[PDB]
Each structure stands twice: as C-alpha cells, then as structure tokens.
Design a protein around this ligand. Sequence first.
Ligand SMILES: *CCC(=O)Nc1cc(Nc2ncc(C(=O)OC(C)C)c(-c3cn(C)c4ccccc34)n2)c(OC)cc1N(C)CCN(C)C
Length: 317
Amino acid sequence: GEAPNQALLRILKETEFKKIKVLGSGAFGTVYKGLWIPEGEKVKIPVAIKELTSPKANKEILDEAYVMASVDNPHVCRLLGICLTSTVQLITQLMPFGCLLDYVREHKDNIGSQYLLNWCVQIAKGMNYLEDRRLVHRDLAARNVLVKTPQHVKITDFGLAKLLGAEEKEYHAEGGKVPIKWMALESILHRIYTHQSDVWSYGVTVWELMTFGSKPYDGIPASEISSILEKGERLPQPPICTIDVYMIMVKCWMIDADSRPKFRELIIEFSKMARDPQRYLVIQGDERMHLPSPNFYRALMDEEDMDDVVDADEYLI
Ligand SMILES: *CCC(=O)Nc1cc(Nc2ncc(C(=O)OC(C)C)c(-c3cn(C)c4ccccc34)n2)c(OC)cc1N(C)CCN(C)C
C-alpha cells in the first residue's frame, strides 16, 4: 500500500541538446555539460549529461532515472529526462559550481561559518524529503552534494538509492563496491541500510565540510574501519567546530541507529546555529570572507546569445 508513482518520464531527442564539454570520466562513464534547447520554446537550459552496450549499464542508468524522476525538492537534483540513443543518457540540471567537496577545498580561505551552517541545513532538508518519500540514498557524501550557487546546494548521485516498501523498514543489500568510510557500522557488518544509516553518512559529510574537504580516516585502509568503529573510535573534532557542532556529529555516529538524530531535527539544530554562526564555528577572518554568485553562462558554456538561458528550476513541465 505505497501509493501509485504517477511521476512522468520525459524522453529527449538527441537533436535537442549539445554536449558542450566533458566534466568527468570514471567507472560510471562520462558526465558532460551542455545546453538543452526544447524545440519551439525559446529557452536554453544548461544540463549535465551522463552516458555509462553492456545491457547492465543500460539497466543501472534507468534505475537512477526512475529514482530521480520520483523526487521533486529544492535541495535534491532535478531530473530533466533521458535520451534513448545507442547508450542511454541521463539529462539532469547543470550545477555550475561543481561538487561541494571540491568547492570547500578550492575556496577554503573564503568560506565563512554562515555558508557552512547553511549547507548543513539544506542537506538535511533534502535528506528529510527523501525520508518522506521513503527513499534511502546509501551514498551521501560531500562529493555527492552539488553547488548550484554558493547559497544553494542539492543532493545528487542516486546510483545506490533504494525505495522502501511500506512494510520494508530496512534494506538488506548484498555484495557491491560500497563507500566504507561513509557507512554506518550496521551497514558494514550486516549490509543494512536505513534512513538512520543515512544519518551516519550525514555526519561524515558534515565532517568533510568542517575540515574543508579532508578525507575521513586518512591513511587507514577500509578493512580496518569496522574494527576501529567497534572499539568506540570516531572522526576527530575539527578545529573550527565548537563542542555544540561536534556533539551533533558524534550523535550521528551512535551504535544505536534509533539514538541518532533524525533529519527533521538536524534541520532545526543547524537552523538555530545559522542564526548566530560565529558562536558555533570559529573561523579566522570569518567576517571578511565573501563567495561569488554570478555572462558567466557564456563562459560556462561558450555560446553567447545566452539571453534566453533558463535554469531548470525555472523550467517546469
Ligand atoms: C566533484 C565533481 C564535480 O561535481 N565536478 C563538476 C560538476 C559540475 N556540474 C554538474 N552538474 C550536474 C551533475 C549531475 O548530477 O548530473 C549528472 C548527469 C549525474 C554533475 C555530475 C554528476 N556526477 C556523478 C559527476 C561526475 C563527475 C563530474 C560531474 C558530475 N555535475 C560542474 O559544472 C560545470 C563543474 C565541475 N567541476 C569541474 C569542478 C572543478 N572546477 C569547478 C574547479
């Protein structure tokens, strides 16, 4: 009894979008940035295009398309559709400033406490929406949070995301390359994933931001993480973090998954701290830091006549 998923899957003609440049290859495939021009509509939509014909690949890319077509939230990446070429392509909204992990590493000396705490609120809002949709992300990390503007981030990468039945409270997975250093202890031992195991990944994600992009358990091989966590060891307190912020991170790493805070409560706590940011994050020169917010599309694309550019958040069905 989980309610019909009447979401619409849009099919895009390959003639409607142009791969302007390549953003990053890898085991998945290649992610391109480009422009989508729906025929008849005088709009040019900046998009990201992923191509992974190993029948399997086509199968995994469609699972990700199914999940993304089912979510609609200001802090979750918006799916624009798929293209049915020889290999199936994923067409999503282009996030011009990249992933949050690279962003905090690049702009370390210009990120104040206001931006860090606001990012924590927005990530919790997106994860709380995913919990409302009964969706477990299973791969929450700083690399999987994209930056539309320095004031607006969205959760991305639903290759491992799962939807739970109204009786399924947990998700028992099987084998699969899984990011060990972001998983909860129950996910490493028993391969169980819940919304509370996503909370653990949320705590590690916050730790990445507060350390300006440090690697969790740097130098420790992944096979030792399960034994490190069982002894009671956790990630250290970042230098900018007051005990108030670090206490929240520690609570996300409790052994009892039901003792970890809920996403709706992480929204409230970080929202309070965002109203007095320098009380909870001590950063040298916090009051003088400034991040951009841009033209810049002509550069981020190449074409001019970017007078009809429309962000995907302003182009609705
Ligand atoms: C950390 C890597 C990174 O994000 N780099 C990056 C990304 C982007 N924009 C962007 N927008 C949307 C998507 C996306 O979700 O859609 C695809 C089709 C799934 C992505 C994206 C998603 N994955 C899995 C990626 C892997 C590699 C690269 C990108 C994606 N990315 C931009 O916008 C121009 C830039 C950018 N870079 C190169 C960061 C480094 N410079 C900004 C310094």
